[PDB]
Structure formats: structure tokens, C-alpha cells
Amino acid sequence: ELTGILKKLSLEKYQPIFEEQEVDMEAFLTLTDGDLKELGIKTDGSRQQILAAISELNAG
Amino acid sequence: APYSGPQDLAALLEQIGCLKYLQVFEEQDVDLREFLTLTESDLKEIGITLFGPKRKMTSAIARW
């Protein structure tokens, strides 16, 4: 699930954003770079890692 | 019948786990037909202020 994905990326510091914004897995898998910026994840590397994770999950 | 659209707004919201917003729509007299015409900023203006539910709704609108 989401918390596990962030844990594996060492990005659990962003978990409170997703929780408060009620981003479930369905919504999470639709997130773009622009969406992550809007949610407040301003660090480029953080977005790169999250998007890479999303990409692998959606692959196929 | 399988794979047909939702019969009404409650049905759509149930499908996307957003029934917590049904009464907000009802208070604005937004039924299924009107809901399917809304844009992202329309949803925000009605009170769907959180990213997750608003995204599931814009996805549903595009879907149906």
C-alpha cells in the first residue's frame, strides 16, 4: 500500500500529505509531476522517485 | 446490466468511495447529470477541497 511504497523509497516524511489529502491508491497512481508539486512536494528528487515508483506500478 | 454507468449520483459516489460528499451535492441540487458536467474547479468551489476525492471525481466524470 501507499505507506509501504513511501517507506521503501525512504520518503515516509511525505505520508502526512497523502493522508490528509485523502489520496488512496487509485488516486495515487494518477499523480503527475504537476500534481506532486501542487500537493507540496517541492523537492525535484522526491518527485522523481515517487513518479518512478508510480510508473513501475502502472507498467503494462 | 454489466458495465453500464451508475444509475444516479449516489451510485457513482459509492463506486469511488466518496459517499461522504453526497449531501454536499444534494444541498446544491447537483444530480448525476449535472455532476457529469462539472470541471475540477467546479468541484473545488462546491467544497471538494481535498486532492484525493476531487481526483477520483474528475476521473469518474471523464470515465462516464
Side-chain angles (χ1 to χ4, degrees):
Chain A
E1 63 181 275
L2 192 42
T3 60
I5 295 173
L6 293 177
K7 271 276 185 288
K8 290 178 182 180
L9 296 174
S10 299
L11 298 180
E12 56 263 53
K13 67 192 183 296
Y14 299 122
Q15 195 280 331
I17 293 174
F18 297 104
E19 187 182 339
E20 195 165 71
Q21 291 290 310
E22 293 177 19
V23 179
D24 60 7
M25 187 62 30
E26 178 186 335
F28 180 76
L29 291 176
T30 73
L31 293 174
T32 62
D33 191 54
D35 295 336
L36 294 167
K37 291 182 175 176
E38 180 178 328
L39 283 166
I41 306 180
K42 42 190 191 171
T43 305
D44 289 357
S46 294
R47 298 193 310 282
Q48 192 277 333
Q49 290 189 259
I50 292 168
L51 292 168
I54 290 168
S55 181
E56 174 164 355
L57 287 171
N58 289 332
Chain B
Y3 316 120
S4 57
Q7 327 85 248
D8 57 21
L9 183 55
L12 186 153
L13 295 181
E14 178 175 24
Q15 200 169 350
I16 61 174
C18 285
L19 276 171
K20 66 185 281 191
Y21 298 105
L22 175 64
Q23 298 203 314
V24 168
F25 288 113
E26 287 180 342
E27 179 66 24
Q28 302 306 127
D29 307 316
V30 173
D31 63 339
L32 180 60
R33 184 167 153 269
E34 181 175 7
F35 176 85
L36 294 172
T37 75
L38 300 177
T39 70
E40 182 177 56
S41 70
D42 291 333
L43 292 165
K44 184 178 173 174
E45 182 183 45
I46 289 166
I48 317 307
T49 71
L50 307 178
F51 194 99
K54 178 157 43 67
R55 172 57 54 86
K56 292 194 292 187
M57 290 173 197
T58 59
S59 293
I61 286 163
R63 178 158 47 254
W64 305 113

